[PDB]
Design a protein around this ligand. Structure first.
Ligand SMILES: Nc1ncnc2c1ncn2[C@@H]1O[C@H](COP(=O)(O)OP(=O)(O)OP(=O)(O)O)[C@@H](O)[C@H]1O
Lengths: 59, 245
């Protein structure tokens, strides 16, 4: 389904946008994955985010 | 015939170099052509060729800004080559120098750069500088980034980005070590020994292939503290131009 990274509260806050900006994080004048570094994802008190792309076990 | 004398340029263009008509004929150039000029150390840029009869044979005119960029003074010698492959910069980001925005308000872009880039097609290269007289003041700008890289031409289609912090003039030298052989005195035999073992294996690695030997790798300098060992090593590294760690 869409709840694997692209749903509600993942489009209100550009989580994919945050990840991509962290990737190309330079002045300089889509896919979401865990190949890189974290970028500060700050939300106000009283908001919980469960929309992180799942990872599943070792299988 | 790429060695020419340096003269002060009377004109007020940061990217114009004048050449004698005979000099232009020898190098096979045309009026308005862009050519690459390389000066001392590893500093080089591109300038628009102009024809000026008054110029003597083997001489060229460059303003003080070009002299500062090329790390040369009046009457010095440079190497000039044709630059016909220069393209047009599609997207350039440049920021002003802090000391040049002292009290200047308004849209600095429109005030200064826009008259300076009205079909001017001024050649630009990474790290270059250029001064524009706007109103009753003068503002300097630096080539922070260009696309396509490295050397290009700023045209109307180019997108100019003037967003960014002011460029303080102090850190260009205070925080950065750009020291050449001119900053070393009293030790020439040591400099020769270091150079003949550092530059030769790197600048001309094919010689040791030709003679079939492995040039020595390590080098160990020593002497009383404060004799400039660090400065000598820094100068050699900068002159060589190789990635220095
Ligand atoms: N030709 C020169 N020989 C020696 N010192 C010079 C020379 N030209 C300038 N200096 C100045 O002398 C001082 C040398 O300091 P430097 O850090 O190079 O010494 P050092 O003993 O090699 O250092 P270290 O071992 O701590 O790296 C600096 O102020 C440098 O500017």
């Amino acid at each position: 389904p869409s709840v694997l990274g692209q749903g509600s509260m993942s489009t209100r806050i550009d989580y994919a946008g945050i990840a991509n900006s962290s990737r190309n994080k330079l002045s300089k004048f889509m896919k979401i994955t865990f190949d890189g570094e974290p970028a500060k994802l700050d939300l106000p008190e009283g908001q919980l985010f469960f929309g992180f792309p799942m990872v599943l076990p070792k299988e | 015939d790429n060695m020419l004398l340096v003269d002060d340029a009377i004109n007020d263009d940061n990217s114009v170099i004048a050449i004698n008509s005979n000099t232009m004929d020898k190098l096979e150039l045309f009026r308005g052509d862009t050519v690459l000029v390389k000066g001392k150390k590893r500093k080089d840029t591109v300038l628009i060729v102009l024809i000026d009869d008054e110029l003597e044979d083997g001489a060229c005119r460059i303003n003080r800004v070009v002299r500062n960029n090329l790390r040369i003074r009046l009457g010095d010698l440079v190497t000039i080559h044709p630059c016909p492959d220069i393209k047009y910069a599609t997207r350039i980001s440049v920021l002003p120098i802090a000391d040049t925005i002292e009290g200047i308000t308004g849209n600095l872009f429109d005030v200064f750069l826009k008259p300076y880039f009205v079909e001017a097609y001024r050649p630009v290269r990474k790290g270059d500088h250029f001064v524009v007289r706007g109103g009753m003041r003068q503002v300097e700008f630096k080539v922070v980034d260009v696309e396509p890289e490295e050397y290009a031409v700023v045209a109307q289609d180019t997108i100019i980005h003037w967003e960014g912090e002011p460029i303080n003039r102090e850190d260009e030298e205070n925080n950065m070590n750009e020291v050449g052989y001119d900053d070393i005195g009293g030790c020439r035999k040591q400099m020769a020994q270091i150079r003949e073992m550092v530059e030769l294996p790197l600048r001309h690695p094919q010689l040791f292939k030709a003679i079939g030997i492995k040039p020595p790798r390590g080098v160990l300098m020593y002497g009383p503290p404060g004799t400039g060992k660090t400065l000598m090593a820094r100068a050699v590294a900068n002159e060589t131009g190789a990635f220095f760690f």
